C-alpha cells in the first residue's frame, strides 16, 4: 500500500521538521525568488541553489554542463542502481530586467515567479533537510534537481540533458517534476508541440513589368489554406495555428521573401507526428504548385523550413506504479487527484518511456506567469500542501 | 502643318535666348534640385518656384490650395478662353532627410531628383523667359505649372486639384506634363492603378485552448489564392499583385489582426474595374467562407477595406491634334516618336477627357528615382533637347 508511508515514524518525524522550519522555508522562497532567472539566464540562481543543496546535506552536489543544479540523497541500495529524480525548475517566464521584489501582504507574497516555480525549489530543499534530520532511510537514491529550461523557448533543455547526456541518464526510473502550487495536481500526460517558421523566397520583380512571375506570397497563402484542411481529432486533443506573418516591401514589387509561423500540438505523439508530416508535405506541395502556376523564368520559389520550438508529447499510463503512488497519497491526504495533460518538464521523461508525473508544491497561489503573481504562505495550508509531495516521493523511493 | 512652328521667326528668336541663357537654366536646375521636395513636402520648393515664375514675367502667379505653383503667359484671344496647361512636377520620390547636393562631373550633374523632375521645372522657366523676351504672341493662354504630387503616394493630388477644383479646371483644353529627360518620348496612354490594404480581424485566442475559432490569417490567405485566379488580359495589359503582409504576435495565439496589401493595374479603365470588382467580391467570399468553416462563438472575422492608391487609366487618341503636334515636332527634330503608355500626371487629364501628352525635357540623363541619378548638361545636347518641348507647346497654343 503506497499511502502507508504516511503512517511511518520517519515521515511523521520529517513533517514535524517541515513544521518547525516552515519559517526557514519561506525565507528561502523569498531569497530565491529575488534572484531573477529568465530563460537561458538561470546561472545565478543555479549557483545559489547549488549552495543550498550542499547546505541541506546532500551528496555529490554539482552543476552539470547544461546548468542544472543537483544533489543526491543516498539510499540503502547498491551504488549506481535505479533511482528517483525530483526536479523543480530554476527558470521563470520573466525576461531580464523584470523588477522582482517580494511584497508581503498579510500571509500573501507577491512577486513574479514566486509560485511557478520558485516555491518548489524551496520545498525540495526543505524535504532534503527534514529527511536527513529525521534519519529517513530510502531504498532507492533520490536525485534532487533544480533544472533549467522548463519555460518558453528553453524547451526542456535541462531535463533533456539530465536524461540523455548526464551522469544520471541510466539511473532515473521514476521522474517527478514539482511545478506550481496545487498539491492535488497529478499531470500524467504531456502535450507536445512543434513550431516552424517557413520563409518563402522568389526572384521578385516589378509588379507591373514582371507580372506573371511566381510570387512566394501565393505559395505561403496556399500553405495556410491546405494547413487548415488537416483533420484534427477532438480526442486526443490535436491543434494547429497559422499565427505570425511578414514580408514584402511595397505594392510596386512582387515580394522576394515572405514568412509564416505555424503551431501544432497534440496530447498524442502519433497525432502530432501525423500533423507535422502533413504540414511539411503541404509546404513542399505549395512551392511546387506555385512553380507550376506562374513563370519560373527568373528563378523558382523556394522554401526554408526552420524549426522554432519543439516539445515531445507522451503519457504515463494510469496503471504505472508512480501514478498509483501519487494517486494514493493525494487521496489519503483528503484531496481529489484528477489526472491531467499539460506541457511540463515531465514531457521529456514521458517521451523516453520513463514513468513520470508532475506534482504541486502545496498551498494557495494565483496569477502564475503574470506580473502580479502571488502565493499564500499561511502556515496551516502551506505546510499541509508541502507534506503531499514528500509522501509521494518517499512512497516511490521506498523507505526502510 | 505643325512643325512649321520650327521655322517661325519667333521660335528661332526664342531658341537664341535659350542658348544665351543656357547657363542660367543650369544654375536654376541646381538651385531647385537642392531644395528637397519629398512627397507631401513640396512647399519649400513651391515657394521658390513661384518666385521664379514671377521673375520670368508671368502674370497671376500664385500657389493654389493644393500647393501647385502657376503663372500665365497671356495669349491674344479673349480673357477666360480655352488654354494650354504645361506642368512639371515639384516633388521627387526621395524621402525627407535624403542628402541632396549636386556633384559636378565633367558636364554631368549628379543629385537625387535632378532629372525627374527638377530639370523640367527649370526648362519651363527658360521657355517663359525666352518667349517673353523674344515677344512671342500665342493665341491661347499658356498656364505654366509646378505641380505637386506626381510621385508615389502623392497620387496626382496636384493635377487632380488643378483640373477638378481649381480656377483653370474648365479652361484647360490641352494638357502637357514635362516629366523626365527623354525628348523623344510621347506618352499618350495612362496606366491606371488601384491599391488596397485589407485588414482582417478576429477575436484571437489561445492557439491550443481556443483551437476551432475563426482565424483572420486563413481568410486573408484564401483571398490571395483566389485573387491569383482572376483572369488578366495581356492586351490591354492588366496586372495585379499581393505585395505586403503582416500581423500576429506568436505561435501561442490565434491572430486577431492581419493585413495584406494588393496592387491592380491596367491600360484600360474597364479591365481595371473588372479586376477591382472581382477582388472585392473575393475578399467578401473569403470572410464568409472562414466564418462558415470555423467557430464565430467569440466573434466573426471582419475585413476593413482601405484604398491606399488610386490613379485613373486612360489614353489620348493618336488622331488628337495634341498628339499630331508632338509627333510632327519630334520627327522634324530628327528624333523617333514612339507613343507609349506610362503612369504620369497626364493620366488625370486623360480621365477627364482633356487631350494630354507627357513629354521630355531634353538631353541625356539616367538612374531616375535612384540615389545616383544624374543628367548631362553639355550645352549642345541639353539645349537642342530643350527646344523640342518649346516647339510642341507653341504649335499647340498657336502663334501669330
Ligand atoms: Gd521556526
Ligand atoms: Gd512551470
Ligand atoms: Gd516623374
JSON list of N, CA, C and O in Angstrom, two decimals, chain B residues 7 115 213 230 349 385:
[
{"chain": "B", "resi": 7, "resn": "UNK", "atom": "N", "xyz": [10.08, 76.98, -87.95]},
{"chain": "B", "resi": 7, "resn": "UNK", "atom": "CA", "xyz": [10.65, 77.93, -88.90]},
{"chain": "B", "resi": 7, "resn": "UNK", "atom": "C", "xyz": [10.11, 79.33, -88.72]},
{"chain": "B", "resi": 7, "resn": "UNK", "atom": "O", "xyz": [10.47, 80.22, -89.49]},
{"chain": "B", "resi": 115, "resn": "UNK", "atom": "N", "xyz": [16.81, 64.88, -62.63]},
{"chain": "B", "resi": 115, "resn": "UNK", "atom": "CA", "xyz": [16.17, 64.72, -63.94]},
{"chain": "B", "resi": 115, "resn": "UNK", "atom": "C", "xyz": [14.67, 64.47, -63.87]},
{"chain": "B", "resi": 115, "resn": "UNK", "atom": "O", "xyz": [13.91, 64.92, -64.73]},
{"chain": "B", "resi": 213, "resn": "UNK", "atom": "N", "xyz": [-11.68, 28.30, -33.25]},
{"chain": "B", "resi": 213, "resn": "UNK", "atom": "CA", "xyz": [-12.14, 29.62, -33.60]},
{"chain": "B", "resi": 213, "resn": "UNK", "atom": "C", "xyz": [-11.65, 30.04, -34.98]},
{"chain": "B", "resi": 213, "resn": "UNK", "atom": "O", "xyz": [-10.65, 29.53, -35.50]},
{"chain": "B", "resi": 230, "resn": "UNK", "atom": "N", "xyz": [-7.88, 35.38, -60.74]},
{"chain": "B", "resi": 230, "resn": "UNK", "atom": "CA", "xyz": [-8.61, 36.38, -61.54]},
{"chain": "B", "resi": 230, "resn": "UNK", "atom": "C", "xyz": [-8.00, 36.45, -62.94]},
{"chain": "B", "resi": 230, "resn": "UNK", "atom": "O", "xyz": [-6.76, 36.53, -63.07]},
{"chain": "B", "resi": 349, "resn": "UNK", "atom": "N", "xyz": [-5.72, 64.23, -66.69]},
{"chain": "B", "resi": 349, "resn": "UNK", "atom": "CA", "xyz": [-6.35, 64.87, -67.84]},
{"chain": "B", "resi": 349, "resn": "UNK", "atom": "C", "xyz": [-7.01, 63.85, -68.77]},
{"chain": "B", "resi": 349, "resn": "UNK", "atom": "O", "xyz": [-8.14, 64.06, -69.24]},
{"chain": "B", "resi": 385, "resn": "UNK", "atom": "N", "xyz": [17.73, 69.44, -76.95]},
{"chain": "B", "resi": 385, "resn": "UNK", "atom": "CA", "xyz": [16.61, 68.71, -76.37]},
{"chain": "B", "resi": 385, "resn": "UNK", "atom": "C", "xyz": [15.55, 69.63, -75.77]},
{"chain": "B", "resi": 385, "resn": "UNK", "atom": "O", "xyz": [14.34, 69.38, -75.90]}
]
